[PDB]
Amino acid sequence: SGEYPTVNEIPVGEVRLYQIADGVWSHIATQSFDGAVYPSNGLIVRDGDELLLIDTAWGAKNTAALLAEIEKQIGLPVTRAVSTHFHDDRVGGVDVLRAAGVATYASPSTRRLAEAEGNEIPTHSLEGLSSSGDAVRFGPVELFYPGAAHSTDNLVVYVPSANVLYGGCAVHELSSTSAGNVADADLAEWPTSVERIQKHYPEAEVVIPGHGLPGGLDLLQHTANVVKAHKN
Ligand SMILES: C[C@@H](c1cccc2c(-c3ccc(CS(C)(=O)=O)c(F)c3)c(C(=O)O)[nH]c12)N1C(=O)CN(CCCCN)C1=O
Ligand SMILES: [Zn+2]
Numbered sequence: 001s002g003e004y005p006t007v008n009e010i011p012v013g014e015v016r017l018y019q020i021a022d023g024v025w026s027h028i029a030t031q032s033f034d035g036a037v038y039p040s041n042g043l044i045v046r047d048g049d050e051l052l053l054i055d056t057a058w059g060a061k062n063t064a065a066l067l068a069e070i071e072k073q074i075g076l077p078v079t080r081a082v083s084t085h086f087h088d089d090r091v092g093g094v095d096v097l098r099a100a101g102v103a104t105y106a107s108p109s110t111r112r113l114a115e116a117e118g119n120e121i122p123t124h125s126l127e128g129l130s131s132s133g134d135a136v137r138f139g140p141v142e143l144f145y146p147g148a149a150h151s152t153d154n155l156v157v158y159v160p161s162a163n164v165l166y167g168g169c170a171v172h173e174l175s176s177t178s179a180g181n182v183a184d185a186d187l188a189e190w191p192t193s194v195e196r197i198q199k200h201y202p203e204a205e206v207v208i209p210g211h212g213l214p215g216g217l218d219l220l221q222h223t224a225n226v227v228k229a230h231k232n
């Protein structure tokens with residue numbers, strides 16, 4: 001009823017949307033992995049009379065439900081999707097998207113990692129993102145490669161019309177004490193990568209993590225802190 005959705009308020013097998021700004025929504029879904037349940041976020045950005053999707057809803061059925069929720073709530077066609085790293089919470093559902101006619105994109109790094117992992121593989125490669133600090137435009141967003149963090153391939157997404165920074169899994173929510181699933185992380189580089197985000201997007205007004213509640217710029221420093229404490 002207006003609060004940011006959580007696993008306790010999303011019915012089984014469903015997806016919820018949350019309005020972030022004019023023409024900007026997050027999507028929230030839940031999934032189980034290794035016998036625990038987790039929420040995860042993605043982004044939807046209006047692109048004229050079409051939509052740009054950032055990240056799947058973590059699974060084929062969740063991603064089908066995401067498409068249905070978008071049709072119900074927004075009613076504009078999703079024409080393109082970008083996955084911000086190779087893990088299943090970002091690419092699981094790309095096959096659903098592709099069969100629905102959505103053009104799916106990721107960096108070449110992400111596409112290689114997804115293929116090697118046995119995860120679903122976005123169709124189109126996003127060049128111009130291979131060095132830390134690189135940025136490219138993609139419809140109504142800027143894509144930015146901050147360096148290795150949660151994963152070596154993680155991208156961040158900025159919506160300049162609204163000053164919305166979608167950090168993806170390189171950014172944690174404020175209530176976190178721990179640094180999430182670090183299996184593929186670079187804990188030593190992660191703070192440097194966060195510093196690059198802070199320097200590039202100093203006017204961000206909303207910061208959205210890959211999992212959990214959006215907030216402000218504090219999520220960036222908080223993430224650096226939790227990562228350093230984990231490494232320690
Ligand atoms: C699919 C993905 C994955 C699964 C389960 C949980 C998470 C989490 C995660 C987020 C927040 C918290 C709460 S908190 C801040 O308080 O800790 C948490 F507890 C875990 C993250 C994330 O941090 O973004 N991602 C996860 N994922 C990986 O990321 C690495 N991996 C292993 C490789 C599998 C290859 N097929 C995996 O399955
Ligand atoms: Zn991940």
Ligand SMILES: [Zn+2]
Binds near residue numbers: 087169210211
């Ligand atoms: Zn994640």
